[PDB]
Amino acid sequence: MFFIKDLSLNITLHPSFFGPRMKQYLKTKLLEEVEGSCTGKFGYILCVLDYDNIDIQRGRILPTDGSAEFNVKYRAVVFKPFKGEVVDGTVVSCSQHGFEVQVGPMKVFVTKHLMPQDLTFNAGSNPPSYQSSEDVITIKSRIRVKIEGCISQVSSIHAIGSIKEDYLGAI
Amino acid sequence: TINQLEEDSKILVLRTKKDKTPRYVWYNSGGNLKCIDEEFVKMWENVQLPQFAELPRKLQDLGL
Amino acid sequence: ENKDMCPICKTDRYLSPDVKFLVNPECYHRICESCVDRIFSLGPAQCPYKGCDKILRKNKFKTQIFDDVEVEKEVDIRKRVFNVFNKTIDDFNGDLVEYNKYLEEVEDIIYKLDHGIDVAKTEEKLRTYEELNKQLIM
Ligand SMILES: [Zn+2]
Ligand SMILES: [Zn+2]
């Protein structure tokens, strides 16, 4: 789910970048290293709100290296999936054990054993689709998936969905 | 005759095949009842028991 | 009964019968809690209750006070028949014989639905229940 939360992080700055306009350099490292990433504690990071009222706080110097340490509080939106969560998406890659469905920025595989039994793997077709008793699940089809479990590795969050139960399968 | 009088009719003593079952004089009531699988025997022997008054107290937590 | 409550654990009373025994309305079978949690989590199949083939559906179960299988099914069949027809031609004008003749037709159709008949008048009553549902929409 797409959630907004005020977060913070510590920034290490090279001493050559120590001029009066370094607050822009603070804004330089903030956008390119936070937005478009993922964290295991918060999810896939999306966009940072409020570009003007950003807490720069102060700045400390570590004993080694000569670099400078900071702590910048802000406001940003993230995307954190969960268990038992019903979502949608589109298939990108397929397999003989199921297929993987792109859900926004995160691709989630669905296993064949988490599918109904009448759903059958079509192998000789190009692309190798999945044909049931009424529908043929291909690449560009849109499929309503309920997320079963998730993997919360740091900066690499994965999940597992299914379409076995009622009101599921393709949209 | 011991083999034909199975199930507590001739609870002998199968000492060894080399000893050709050096038999003894005993008889129970049911004797055989060998439908218990040996998988049930291993699980019967893999259980450790909290002794003394613990297992009566755990039986009240269990039901007995 | 205690001798039949689950196809896998029929007499769990010696092993502390702490779970319930659900009954599916499309199966009418004594199915315990622990075994059925594995059932609907892995797809909607049938129960093997004495080799049954009626496909059990996910959720939509019920607790029962044991009105056998007939009166447990006839109570839900009469409750489903009392909502579609509602109080049409009954107390709309203080009618008595016309209300009793309309209730006798509702009772005989429920008796035909309870007995099963031959799936002809019940299918005609299924259209009449569809007629009682379409008349309540206009
Ligand atoms: Zn059982
Ligand atoms: Zn059944």
Helix (H), strand (E), coil (C) string for A40-54 = CCCEEEEEEECCCCC
Token pair of A87, please? 């979502």
Which distant-in-sequence residues (6+ apart) come within 8 Å of A111 by Cβ? A97, A98, A160, A162
d(CA A127, CA A138): 7
Distance from CA of C36 to the nearest CA of A (A): 15
Max intra-chain CA distance, chain B: 51
Cα A64 to Cα A12: distance, rounded to the nearest angstrom: 12
Token pair for B50? 């909290």
C42 touching chain A per CB within 8 A: yes
Structure determined by:
cryo-EM
Is the bond preceding A116 in cis, omega lying within 30 degrees of 0?
A: no
∠ CA C115-C118-C121, rounded to 5°: 85
Tell me how crowded residue A131 is: count the other CB atoms within 10 A of its CB. Answer: 15
A85-171: CATH topology is OB fold (Dihydrolipoamide Acetyltransferase, E2P) (2.40.50)
DSSP-based three-state secondary structure for C32: strand
Domains of chain A: which residue ranges? 1-84, 85-171
CATH number for the region A1-84 comes to 3.30.1490.120
Separation of alpha carbons A40 and A59, rounded Å: 27
Proximal ligand: closest to the CA of C49: 2
Contact A66, A16 (CB under 8 A): no
| Integer Cα distance of A140 and C3 in angstroms | 54
Answer whether C80 touches A (CB < 8 Å): no
Helices (H), chain C: 33-39, 70-85, 97-115, 121-134
Token pair listed for B10: 């001739």
Nearest to A155 by CA among A34, A32, A39: A39
Q: Cα A79 to chain center, whole Å?
A: 6
- Give the pair of three-digit tokens for residue C76: 């839900």
- Do the chains contact at A165 and C42, CB–CB below 8 Å? no
A88 Cα to the center of ligand 2, angstroms: 34
Residue of chain C nearest A113, judged by CA positions:
C42
User: Which two structure tokens, joined as six digits, stand for A37?
Assistant: 């990433």
Amino acid at A44: Y
Task: Let me know if the fold of A1-84 is the same as that of A85-171.
Answer: no
- Integer Cα distance of B59 and A74 in angstroms: 57
d(CA B23, CA B10): 9
Structure tokens at A161: 């969905």
Give the angle subtended at the CA of A166 by the CAs of A168 and C43, to the nearest 5°: 110
Nearest residue to A9 via CA among A62, A63, A65, A54: A54
Please tell me the distance from the alpha carbon of residue A67 to that of residue A16, in angstroms, as a whole number: 9
Q: What is the DSSP string of chain A?
A: -EEEE--EE--EE-GGG-STTHHHHHHHHHHHHHTT-EETTTEEEEEEE-SSS-B----EE-SSSS-EE--EE-EEEEE---TTEEE--EEEEEETTEEEEEETTEEEEEEGGGS-TT-EE--SSSS--EE-SS-EE-SS-BEEEEEEEEEEETTEEEEEEE--STT-EE-
Which residues in chain A have their CB less than 8 angstroms from residue C42's CB?
Answer: 164
Of all helices (H) and strands (E), which one includes residue C31? Answer: strand C30-32
